[PDB]
Every structure is written in structure tokens, then in C-alpha cells.
Amino acid sequence: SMIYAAPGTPGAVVTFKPRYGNYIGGEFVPPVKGQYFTNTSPVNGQPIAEFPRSTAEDIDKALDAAHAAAEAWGRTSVQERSNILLKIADRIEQNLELLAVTETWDNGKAVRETLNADIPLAADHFRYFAGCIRAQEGSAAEINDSTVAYHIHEPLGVVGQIIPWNFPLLMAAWKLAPALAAGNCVVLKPAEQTPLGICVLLELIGDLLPPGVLNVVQGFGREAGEALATSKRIAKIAFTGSTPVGSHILKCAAENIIPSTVELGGKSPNIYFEDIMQAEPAFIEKAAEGLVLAFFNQGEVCTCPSRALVQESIYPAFMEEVLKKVRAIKRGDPLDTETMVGAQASQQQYEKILSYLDIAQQEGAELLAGGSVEKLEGNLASGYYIQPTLLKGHNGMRVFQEEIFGPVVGVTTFKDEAEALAIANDTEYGLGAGLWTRDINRAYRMGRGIKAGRVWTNCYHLYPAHAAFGGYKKSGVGRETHKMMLDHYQQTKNLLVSYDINPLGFF
Amino acid sequence: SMIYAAPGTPGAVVTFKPRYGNYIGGEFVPPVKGQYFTNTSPVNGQPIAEFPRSTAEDIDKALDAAHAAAEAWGRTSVQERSNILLKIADRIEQNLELLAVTETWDNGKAVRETLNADIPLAADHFRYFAGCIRAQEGSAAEINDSTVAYHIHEPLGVVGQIIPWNFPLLMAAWKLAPALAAGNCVVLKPAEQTPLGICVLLELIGDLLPPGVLNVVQGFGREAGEALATSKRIAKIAFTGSTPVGSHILKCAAENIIPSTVELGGKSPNIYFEDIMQAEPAFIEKAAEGLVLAFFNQGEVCTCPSRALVQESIYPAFMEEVLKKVRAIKRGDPLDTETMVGAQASQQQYEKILSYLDIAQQEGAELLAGGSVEKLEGNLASGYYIQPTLLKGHNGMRVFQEEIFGPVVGVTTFKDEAEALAIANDTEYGLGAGLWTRDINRAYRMGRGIKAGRVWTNCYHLYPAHAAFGGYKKSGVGRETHKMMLDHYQQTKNLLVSYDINPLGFF
Ligand SMILES: NC(=O)c1ccc[n+]([C@@H]2O[C@H](COP(=O)([O-])OP(=O)(O)OC[C@H]3O[C@@H](n4cnc5c(N)ncnc54)[C@@H](O)[C@@H]3O)[C@H](O)[C@H]2O)c1
Ligand SMILES: NC(=O)c1ccc[n+]([C@@H]2O[C@H](COP(=O)([O-])OP(=O)(O)OC[C@H]3O[C@@H](n4cnc5c(N)ncnc54)[C@H](O)[C@@H]3O)[C@@H](O)[C@H]2O)c1
Ligand SMILES: [Mg+2]
Ligand SMILES: [Mg+2]
């Protein structure tokens, strides 16, 4: 149990620069038009540093470097690219605390999360894709005695990637590890709310990559992001974030006829069947933790289990176990490892959540816990903290239909399996679901029946590599965190070779 | 040598109905608002039959039937779906001549093409996907001792497919075989120029599929096609056709957040290196036939080798071999197996090609052969026939950059390999390429260097199943004619199962 000192104060593991540049062609550079913005910490509302408010000119300067690097990088051997990714993972792990404190400071989440989930998972994502590129094969098949089809994976070349602020470094790893393993150059546009972590990381790893292979351009969505998403000099666009912006991203890709992948959030149901109350006491506790895991990362998780569906025959008994855990949630300084729920990422997100709490009250949702701002001591008072909130309601309510992205769960009941499936699928989203039952047949039936990319069965919030992650329905298109992604970042070249010297007989 | 009688005349293998319906819910039905259009044969200009000028209401009635069938079809066993596709293939082969004559009549191409390529390839495509769905596996991987990731392929459900007129039945097979193999229901919108073949096919196979699994709605692109492309009741959209419509299709999918694949034509280069004239005489003949293969299907082929790139050191010698074959092309009745080039598909396409021959004259392209309409005898005088045309020019001309989609090849030269690659890649397209060289190293270097989905090496115009077909750059996104496409027609369900009963330690 320990408390990390705030950056720049005595004992801190890091002191940040007062100003950061874009990372282009192997070096930090200022924005072309010299404009900056100020990034603040959500821990205490206080400013951190200045970052470029880049424009189209910077995106094009980054695309120049990426395009000059792409040919030699795409032709770097699989072994060598793999080995570089293994060194990136090493550097992440050797700097685990530094990166975890940076991430907490910039984003607000509890440092026990960055120490145990974000940074280690980010390092492992690089080892995983370093390994999968070693294993990747195209194909060779004999169509007939003198005709052979070869399929060779090729880099797309230069790709654009736009990431959000809820897992700044993990999202970066999710995007960069496969794109780089596949031999592409990247222009990455981080979320303007969280520009710091990727800058610190680039200071740690930048020398491992040839100049121009990894380019990071800071700035606002409707400026730097839009120049990248509409650019005619990228071969592919990747995006994680809001549904309206994602749809716009897909429209930009449609105009240029380039492939696209997007992950757009969800309204994931956590489904609890009655037989869990006949299982072991540890399992009942695990199921209750699975509901309260909705408050992990302050609910700022695309697969946050924001609807709990509890079989009505066990609702009183099971909710007793749930509420014991909600009530024990320790609040405080996000840099205290004891703290279990940190700060929201921005004032805007803070305001969004408070609006939804009012909408919930107005439409008749009943508060079982929380419901208000969390007022914390000292310097934390200027930060953005909300109480873990549990609302009783029905699936027709707005707060059961729209993604809040705060520490808010709506709980409702169902009578039988058919109704649980109907409520679970009564959403436009389809990113994740949780499923709690010890009957193998129900586990399988519900697992197949839920229209979601991931169904966590008797667990929640596990995001290992080697498990494909992505949307059904409006939650998006494509998959991440699995070697199948390499195909989103590569093109298939079919050499169709004839070894027959004779004409076909047609002309 | 055989001459098929014109449909409806003595000796014909088929006589057509005067009016055809939409195929919805297992039966032929009239359009909701009773509007029809007349389909004419491009062989002789004479009308064939009436087909629905369907509206949004018909699209929604087909989606109703598709959605009522989707669940049971999706849960039908792999063996059973495979066996149905195998029966479809047998029915196609059992009616080979009937179907080949129908396709010539509706589309205009020479019956030797439908007899030897279209119909047999259509039959084999069903066998191929019947076989690939037997072999398909998802995955199971142990993440740790108590955590297993399962990935199960699931049908998308109801999908929309829009196909063009240059290979009416083969295009139908290319889209339908994988979609049905994957357990999806289909709403298919055939090209209004060629509605006939798919109707005859449905008469032969409709009883093999459950009602509502396969629905075919005829009509105009701007009406029936647009209703399908903008539908919020499809999980996926597939399209082959023009660049402007395909981009619009991608925008429609963007709005609805659904996966999409499109193939949008090309300007494919056929590259001839000097060493081929050091090869066997048969091989030189084969290469010369490979250039003249541009006139296969009247040049109405997305990968028509419409730019010929000849190394200048062999240009005189090799063009002598080419022109020998150009001069041998027999014209006449497309129902004569001796006819080597049939009719263009429509007046609009016929006129489009004639415009491009005119543009070619004005910009200085030199006629090496052809260049005018082909005036044919008797009833053919009312059909659409253009001479096989060979223009000498340079790659910057409009006729070297824009897709003509008629029997027209632009020939130009290059000095060395670097120049051949630059000219070959000097296009917005990237669907195919032809590559003729017997030096193993040059074949590999150019094969990798060309930005196109398929590089035919020492052959051209082979479209076997089990060789992936699809675009680089503006030629589209996705792949066809290969088992990897099944992923375009399925969702990945990740069951992430924990067998440990203990809480994680976070809440
Ligand atoms: N393999 C290919 O990509 C391919 C195929 C055929 C033709 N072409 C080229 O495409 C043109 C042929 O003319 P075309 O008008 O028939 O092409 P097209 O793409 O418009 O027609 C093919 C299909 O598009 C549909 N369609 C048209 N408008 C639509 C809309 N607004 N919404 C939904 N669907 C719509 C139907 O017309 C048809 O089934 C060019 O002349 C030719 O060079 C390319
Ligand atoms: N994991 C996720 O799916 C995820 C992540 C963040 C936010 N969200 C949800 O989105 C809501 C709004 O938060 P937000 O405004 O930060 O999301 P956002 O979609 O606006 O921003 C995410 C990223 O897109 C960029 N962007 C914004 N507009 C752009 C444009 N026109 N062109 C190109 N790029 C653009 C942003 O700069 C950022 O990098 C959240 O409350 C939450 O519901 C979801
Ligand atoms: Mg925004
Ligand atoms: Mg059109």
C-alpha cells in the first residue's frame, strides 16, 4: 500500500515538461502555425503542460515523413520488426510506475488500475503482436497441375489512427502494436484530453523505430483529427470513440474508398441467473464483484456493464451482496493505491454524467446508491469526482438506452431466460455482455443468443490479448486485441501463376 | 461447332415467359405498385419479357420474408447448408446449355463464354463454398489455467447484395454462395439490364432453399437498389459496379454502421518484358493471346487488361504476333459457338464506348486495329457490336486512365523494369495486373511491386475459386472468390469463459 507523490513535487517519480511537441520523423517538433493548448489534470483541475494545437499542415508534415519511411519499413524483415516490438514492451515494463503515474495524472483513473491493468496489458500487447507476426503465413495452393495461387500479406503502407482518452496508453498499444507489426507507418492522433502519456512513451521508445514510422500529432478532433480522417494520403483509418464521430469517420473512408475499422461504445448487459445463488459463497461474491466492476475506470469503458439484469427470484438476496460492495468503495487521491475509483477524465465528461443523473431522476429511475458529485478533501476539490451510482429502472428508460460513460449502472429484473435475452438484446449497441450461470446449457444458449462481440461468462472486464474484441450492430465494425486484426492492417496480394506455356484456345 | 436456336424459335433450348415477378418468400410475386419495365436482348434488340420496376415497398416485403426465415436458416447445420449448395451446383450443371443460352440472350456475350466459363464457374463456386463451410473452424485457446477464449462464427443474419450486368449469373454465384454458406438470408438486387438469368435460375433451384432465405427484387438502381442500400434492416451490404455508386454504397453503410464490401472496376495493366521473345514459340503465342484476351466478354470485365505495357525493345516483334490474333477474331451470331466476341450489354454501354473511341482520336491515340461499330447481318443489325480496338498512346491520356468497359486496349511502351512498375501503378485503380516474364526474380519483384489485388503471372483472365479477388486503392475493399470472404458474411462471437470461482480482488 503506497501513495505516489504528485508529479514535480518532492519524491515524485516524474516531472513533466512545460511544453510538448508533435513527434514527426524521429523528433519532437512544434506545430507549423505555432498554436498550443493547455492540458489539465482531472485529479485536481490544475494545468500540466502545453501541447500542439495542430492543423492540416502538421498532419501533412507527418504524412510526408510516414511516406518517406514506408517502403524500407514495409521491407524490414518480420524477425526485425518483431524484435523491435519486443524491445518496446521491455521499455514499457522497465518504466511501469512512471507511465502509470503519468496516466493517472493525465486521465484521472485510480493508479491501482494503471499499475495492474493499463501498463502491463500495454506491454503485453506488444509482445503478443510481436509473436503473432512471427507466426503469420500467407498461402500457396495448387489450383491445377500448372496453376498455383499464392497469397502474400503486404503492408497497407501509411495508416491513420485516432484514439480516445479513457485508456490513453492501452488504446495506443491496441492500435500501434498490430499496425507496426504488419509493417505500416502510422500517423496517430491522440485525444486532446490526454496528450501526455503518449509523449512520455515516445521519449522512452522513439529511438527503437526508424524516423517516420511512428508519428504522433496532437490536436483537436475537428482540426487535427478531421485533417487525418479526410486525408487522401492514408491507406486505412482506425478509430475508437463516439458513435457520431465514428459514423463520420466511416463516411470519410467511404469518400476515399479506404478500409476502416471503428469501435463505438456500448450499453452492455450483465445478466445474473438464479442458479448462481446455489453455487459456492466465493462464486456469489465473484458475481457481485462483477456487477460493481461497472465502476472500474469510473465507468469510462466502452464495455462498462451499465445494465444489470438480475433474475427476479434472486434480486433481494443478490442485491444485498452487491450493495455491500458498492458501499465499501474507497474514494480519495487517485495516486493512492488504496483508492478504488478515481476522477472522471474531463469537465465535459463530468458535466455529461451529471446531466444523465438528472435525466434519470426525471424519468423515474430510483437511486439505490450514489447519485451526486463526490466532494473530496484538499486539492482534489477542484477535480472531477462522481459517486458510484446504482439506479433501479426498466430497459425503456433513456439511462438504460444511452451510453453515459460514467460510474452509473441501471439495474432491472427479468422473469425467465427468454426475457433476459430479449432485454439483453433490446439495444442498438452490441459490444459486450456479462453472463452469470453455472448451467452449461444456459451458458452456451445465452452466449450464442446475445448479439455482442464479447460475452464474458462468469467473469467481467478481462481484456487479454488473443481474445477478439469488437462490435455487433452499432458498436462498430472490425476486431481488435487478436491476431485476426493483422488483416485489417495488411493487404492480400494474389500471385496467380501459370507454369503452362500453351495458349488457352480463346484468342 | 454448334448454333443455338434463338429462344422461342424451333429447336431452341428455352422459351421465356412474357412477364416475371420478384422472388420473395419462396414464390414469384408482382411488384406492390404494379409497375414493370421491359428487358430487351442486346443480341438483336428484340424484347424478352417484362420485369418489376420495384419500389421501396418490395424491398421491405423481401426484408420481411428474409427476417422471418433468418433464425432457423442460421441454425441449420453446416452439413445441411453445405448439401443444399451442392444440390444448387448440380442443378446448374444439369441445365448448363439452357442457362448459357439464357445468359447470352440477356447479356449479349458469345455463348462459348457462358458455356465454358460463366455457367461452369458458377456451378463450381457453389461446390467451393459448400466445401469451405464444411472445413471452417472457429477457435479455442487457453489464456490461463482457468480462462478460455472461444471464437464462434455466427451468421450476420439478413444481408443485401447488389450485382452488375456483365456476368449476371456468375456475379450471382460470387455473392450468393458464400452468403448462403455462412447461414445468412439474402435480398439480392440484380442489374436492370440483366434480370432474366437469375429468374430462370430461381425457377430451377428455388425449392432447394427455405422460403425467405433467398429473395430477388428486380428494378432500377435509383429506386429498388437505393431502397436496399439505405435499408436499416440489413446487417451487411455487398456491391459490385461503378465507382460513384460504390462510394455511395459505402456512405450508406457508414450511416448505418454496417460492414460493406465493394468491387469498383479497374484499369489493369498487362506488362510484357523483353525476355518472353527468347522463350518457346508456344509461350510467345500464349503471351499474345493474353493481350487479345482483353476482348473477352467484349471488354466488360472489371479486370479487363485495358492497358498493355510492352518493353520497347520487343514492341515491333511482339505486336506482329498480337495483330495476327486480333485479325482472327470471328464476329457473328453470339449463339454460334464460333463467335469469339459478342454484343455489348446495352445501348448506354455501347454509346459510352463509342464516346471513348472519339475521345481517343481527339487526344492523339493512334488506331492499330478496329475503332468503329461492327455492322452485322440480318437480325443482329439491331444489336450492339463494336470492333476489337487497339490504340497506341501514353499513360497520361484519358483513355489510358478512365475505365471504358468495352473491347478497347491502349498499348504503350517502357524502357526498363523501373519504368514498367511506375506506369503500371500510375492509376487510381488496383484490381488486377498481367505480368509476362520468365525470369523468376523479375516475376517476383514486379508481382510484389504492382499495387493490385491480383497479379496474373504468365497468364490472364483466370478466375478460379480459391484465389482471392479484390481491390487495392479505388478498386474497392474486401475479397471475393476465396474462403477468407466468409468473414465478410459472419460475425465473431468471443465467449471469454472463466472457470475460477474467486473474486478478482478489485471490488
Ligand atoms: N466489376 C465492376 O466493378 C463493374 C461492374 C459493372 C460495370 N462496371 C463499370 O460500371 C459502369 C456500368 O454502368 P452501371 O450504371 O450499370 O453500373 P452500376 O454499379 O450503377 O450497376 C450495377 C448495380 O448498381 C445498382 N445501383 C445503381 N444505383 C444504385 C443506387 N443509387 N443504390 C443502390 N444500388 C444502385 C444497380 O443498378 C446494379 O445492380 C460502367 O459503365 C462500367 O465501367 C464495373
Ligand atoms: N471506447 C469508446 O468507445 C469511447 C471512447 C471515448 C468516448 N466515448 C463515448 O463518446 C462520448 C463523447 O466523448 P468524446 O467527445 O471525447 O468522443 P469523440 O468521438 O468526440 O473523440 C474521440 C477521438 O476522436 C477525435 N475526433 C473528434 N471529432 C473528430 C472528427 N470530426 N474527426 C476526426 N476525429 C475526431 C477526438 O479528438 C478523439 O481523439 C463519451 O461520453 C462516450 O460516450 C467512447
Ligand atoms: Mg468530441
Ligand atoms: Mg449508374
mmCIF file of N, CA and C and ligand atoms in Angstrom, chain A residues 192-193 242 245, ligand 3:
data_model
loop_
_atom_site.group_PDB
_atom_site.id
_atom_site.type_symbol
_atom_site.label_atom_id
_atom_site.label_comp_id
_atom_site.label_asym_id
_atom_site.label_seq_id
_atom_site.Cartn_x
_atom_site.Cartn_y
_atom_site.Cartn_z
ATOM 1 N N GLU A 192 -7.336 14.915 -27.318
ATOM 2 C CA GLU A 192 -6.776 16.157 -26.785
ATOM 3 C C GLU A 192 -6.878 16.214 -25.270
ATOM 4 N N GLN A 193 -7.765 15.424 -24.664
ATOM 5 C CA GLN A 193 -7.860 15.386 -23.208
ATOM 6 C C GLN A 193 -6.659 14.708 -22.567
ATOM 7 N N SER A 242 -16.759 8.050 -30.022
ATOM 8 C CA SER A 242 -18.204 8.193 -30.001
ATOM 9 C C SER A 242 -18.834 7.724 -31.309
ATOM 10 N N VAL A 245 -19.074 10.550 -34.195
ATOM 11 C CA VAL A 245 -17.785 10.756 -34.852
ATOM 12 C C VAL A 245 -17.368 9.507 -35.633
HETATM 13 MG MG MG C 3 -15.819 15.230 -29.044
#
